[PDB]
Amino acid sequence: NSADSANDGFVRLRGLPFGCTKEEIVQFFSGLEIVPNGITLPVDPEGKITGEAFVQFASQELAEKALGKHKERIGHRYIEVFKSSQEEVRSY
């Protein structure tokens, strides 16, 4: 729950570019194992696009191998990372 229990490993992003989507998160953590639609796209930090998002792995541990990415890129922007679970995540 909200960051930890054992399996509910989510992550949150807050940094995405214009038109950002799942498949840019699906390439971000192409590194790692994720449940079959374990990625969530509510809106950006202002509320008109998708510049924050989230991702549920197969485990809490896989989801912190993912915090271990630190920055990388999506599209043209430059993405924060934080630990998460399904109820930090469900802004939609």
In the chain, where are the structural domains located? 7-88
**CB under 8 Å to 82, separation ≥6 — which residues?**
11, 12, 14, 67
Find the DSSP H helices in 1-92. 22-28, 62-67, 86-89
CATH of 7-88, one of 3.40.605.10, 3.30.56.10, 3.40.30.10, 3.30.70.330: 3.30.70.330
Q: For the purposes of burial, counting CB atoms within 10 Å of the CB of 6, is it exposed (0-12), middle (13-18) or buried (19 or more)?
A: exposed
Q: Which residue has the tokens 């679970």?
A: 85
